[PDB]
Amino acid sequence: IDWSTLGFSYIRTDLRYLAHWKDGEWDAGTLTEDNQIHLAEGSTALHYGQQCFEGLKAYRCADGSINLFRPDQNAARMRMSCRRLLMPELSDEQFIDACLQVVRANEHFLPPYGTGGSLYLRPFVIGVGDNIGVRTAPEFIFSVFCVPVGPYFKGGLTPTNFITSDYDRAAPHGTGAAKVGGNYAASLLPGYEAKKRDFADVIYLDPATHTTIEEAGAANFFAITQDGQKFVTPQSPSILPSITKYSLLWLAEHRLGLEVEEGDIRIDELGKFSEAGACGTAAVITPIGGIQHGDDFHVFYSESEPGPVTRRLYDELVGIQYGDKEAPEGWIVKV
Amino acid sequence: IDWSTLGFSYIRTDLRYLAHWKDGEWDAGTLTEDNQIHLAEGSTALHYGQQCFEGLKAYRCADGSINLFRPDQNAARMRMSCRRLLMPELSDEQFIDACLQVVRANEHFLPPYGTGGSLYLRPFVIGVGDNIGVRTAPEFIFSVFCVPVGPYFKGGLTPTNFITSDYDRAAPHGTGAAKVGGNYAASLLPGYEAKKRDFADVIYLDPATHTTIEEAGAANFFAITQDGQKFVTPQSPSILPSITKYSLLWLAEHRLGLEVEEGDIRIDELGKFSEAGACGTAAVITPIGGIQHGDDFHVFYSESEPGPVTRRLYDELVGIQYGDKEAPEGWIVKV
Ligand SMILES: CC(C)CC(=O)C(=O)O
Ligand SMILES: CC(C)CC(=O)C(=O)O
Q1: What family is this (chains A, B) (predicted)?
Q2: Which end of chain A is more exposed for a tag (fewer CB within 10 A), N or C?
Q3: Domains (range + CATH), chain A
């Protein structure tokens, strides 16, 4: 109701989309009001961690129209998750369609242009059915629910700090690059410890020889060279391939005129970048004040303000989302 | 209701234990018959793999008594589990009791003696109640149900084969040591793969550098050196601490006389053992004819019969299970 004090917490919205896959196929799908999910006490979703999901948003423009930011990329990636866990995939039709039904029905829950709100969509897939063994499963449920949400862990483009961990949230040859609940389960601990010290989160390093940056179990990482000319994100099979990263990495080259590089970043060489931040749907480029790596707090630009490049990447990206700045063809679906 | 034909399949028993946890405390915990858990769409257990479980069996003796095997260990382990994922822990009291209750109530589903059957118990804790952002759930569920079962991927001691993997089921410093859903979500794919080519399951090697052996799908690994005089089992901060392995590791030394050693084992130096196999609960010392690693296929004893020492360890353990031998201290509880 009040978009002022709106945060990234849960809120029950009128209706949500639901569909079952049994005997080789998905039902037509329908909007329900249940809010609760019902599954066997032996469901693979509960014991063996066979679950996957997405996070996309819907924004309200100053024209009246509703924007969807690259839904096609979300549908795409889930197919990737679904695979990794022997789960049936969903077409870009059943997906975008779901999201559209779940926004149209809950349209009154969409924050109006002005306040930085947005309608978050959490599409998820879990294996159900009676079972006990370590196999896939006889059935599945695909659901899409939304909640009005403002900033995740930021505010007004204001920066925030991060600290490294000893723990690994994803393995070298694991599901680290898939949005499957497993990865996150392993982040809770190191992430909570990271919060008890008034930090934003935790930046995990390569599983093996923790020497280079991965991401933040909540968003990707990206810095900028001192001569503020190059945009950089680490490349690693273990990090989730963010729609936002790949997007930022796009404007970075064609709209802001910057050199771009996907490659390694040593925690041993932070002073190579002038300003750094994390990115994501709920993350939405978040200035990174400093990084603690033991006896070492490293501050790029300001700890109270964002760098100029971080702001340009923000104002451009966010414009596209709310329809303030012409968006590349193909991105953003009207509603 | 024929036990001669019974395997690791879900059968709906009569009653389940169902305790909650709200506002810092666990409910009393009654029994019911719904085998349909009821979560909240935002459940932490559905999206972030906030979940762990246990595995223990209840067996019926010759004389008439019912044996519950080392339930105290399962209780402790499931504590370590919950701890790693920020979930409230159940004490031996609440735990061990929860089992018993289920054991009794469903006593007719306990296989008779002489069938080599058993009543499988599945205790598990999951995060429930509304949520969204990545953080521990607000409320928690703990439940226990049971099901009768013959053996696992075997029957008798006839062996089976295993294949190495390039994938990894857990990161060096991930959650391999805890029995949590993510673990299995990832041991799902390489499984399907292996079983597709007629291997019992894949045997994971080593997150960072696949030189040593971790464990298999749902079982630890153990071997006997060539002189059949020493017992060697892998030791790493990322493999689940099997109770079984720990138990054989106790017998091998006393009841059997052998020398023990927890250390490393290189797939290279593989013919450095007379026999080997995989222990565990549903598993139950599963011999190993040979191991497919790369091109060459290595075979310790044979693909047809268990190594003598493996046989002994089998009988010694199982005898203790059904009481035809003599269980050590605290090892067994009489329901
Ligand atoms: C959109 C993300 C930044 C939010 C999140 O916690 C996720 O996607 O897992
Ligand atoms: C106790 C285990 C050996 C049973 C099982 O199948 C598992 O844990 O996945």
Answers
A1: Belongs to the class-IV pyridoxal-phosphate-dependent aminotransferase family.
A2: N
A3: 1-155 (3.30.470.10), 156-335 (3.20.10.10)
